Amino acid sequence: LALSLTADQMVSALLDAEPPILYSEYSMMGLLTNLADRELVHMINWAKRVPGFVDLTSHDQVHLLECAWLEILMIGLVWRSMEHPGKLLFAPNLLLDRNQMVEIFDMLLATSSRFRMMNLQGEEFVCLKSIILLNSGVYTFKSLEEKDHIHRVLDKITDTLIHLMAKAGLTLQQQHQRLAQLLLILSHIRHMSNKGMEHLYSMKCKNVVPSYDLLLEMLDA
């Protein structure tokens, strides 16, 4: 069914699957871990709604989640903070400036400024967040049939991004230029995820990273 969707159907699906913006519950690391943990529960249920994701085996679903989770968290943060220059909107009651580790903060800030400079639209945002889910773990995996399916869904999402842009009036040159601009930021999101994951470790927080079994269990629930 996912491969028969039109660009409008794809966008409508992803917009309806969007998680809500959560609040923090009242240390800073404690507040952020608690927020991320509640965000993770919504992310599984969002992932199940990304067209094509539930066609994969449970093992492959876990592997993609297991690789994309912090990138998804981060891209959501950068989206939330777009309209707050100089600050990261972890939650509406948890808005941070740099003075409040700083290297990654600055990288997140730069990404928000870039989305702002590009006038990133929410319909584009949801497509990119789906791309991360399906792409981040695909090169590190039935497996053949599974990878083929993932790449066909990814092509569907490209088509949808191009359709969105054409509908907005972008020339053909502009469509491809913007498509390349958006995807290249995904290489910066990966970078930031890997450094975040390195920073979690150096803070002695290797325990907050969701394990394969946690994801599998959350997904079977």
Ligand X SMILES: O=S(=O)([C@@H]1C[C@@H]2O[C@H]1C(c1ccc(O)cc1)=C2c1ccc(O)cc1)N1CCCc2ccccc21
Quick one: which of 97, 145, 198, 217 contacts a second copy (CB under 8 A)?
Answer: 198
Determine, following the binding rule CB under 6 A, whether residue 200 of this chain makes contact with ligand X.
yes
User: CB–CB of 134/154 below 8 Å?
Assistant: yes
Handedness of CA 35, 52, 160, 147 (dihedral sign): positive
Region of 1-9, 19-27, 171-179, 205-213 interacting with a second copy (CB under 8 A):
171-179
Between residues 25 and 155, which has the closer beta carbon with respect to a second copy? 155
Q: What are phi and psi of 121, to 5 degrees?
A: -95, 150
> What does the per-residue mask of binding to a second copy show for 80-109, with x meaning CB under 8 A?
--------------------------xx--
Number of residues forming the site for a second copy (CB under 8 A): 37
Between residues 20 and 169, which has the closer beta carbon with respect to ligand X? 20
Number of residues forming the site for ligand X (CB under 6 A): 19
Quick one: which of 9, 24, 34, 175 contacts a second copy (CB under 8 A)?
Answer: 175
Determine, following the binding rule CB under 6 A, whether residue 101 of this chain makes contact with ligand X.
yes
Determine, following the binding rule CB under 6 A, whether residue 24 of this chain makes contact with ligand X.
no
HEC profile for the chain?
A: CHHHCCHHHHHHHHHHCCCCCCCCCCCHHHHHHHHHHHHHHHHHHHHCCCCCHHHCCHHHHHHHHHHHHHHHHHHHHHHHCCCCCCEEEEECCEEEECCCCHHHHHHHHHHHHHHHHHCCCHHHHHHHHHHHHHHCCHHHCCHHHHHHHHHHHHHHHHHHHHHHHHHCCCCHHHHHHHHHHHHHHHHHHHHHHHHHHHHHHHCCCHHHCCCHHHHHHHHHC
The interface with a second copy within residues 116-145 (CB under 8 A) comprises: 131, 135-136, 139-140
Closest by Cα among 192, 166, 176, 185 to 117: 185
Determine, following the binding rule CB under 6 A, whether residue 110 of this chain makes contact with ligand X.
no
Known binding residue 188? Answer is no
Determine, following the binding rule CB under 6 A, whether residue 9 of this chain makes contact with ligand X.
no
The interface with a second copy within residues 38-67 (CB under 8 A) comprises: none
Known binding residue 178? Answer is no
Q: Which residues are annotated as a binding site for 17beta-estradiol?
A: 39, 80, 199
Per CB under 6 A, residues contacting ligand X are 28-29, 32-33, 35-36, 39, 73-74, 76-77, 90, 101, 104-105, 196, 199-200, 208
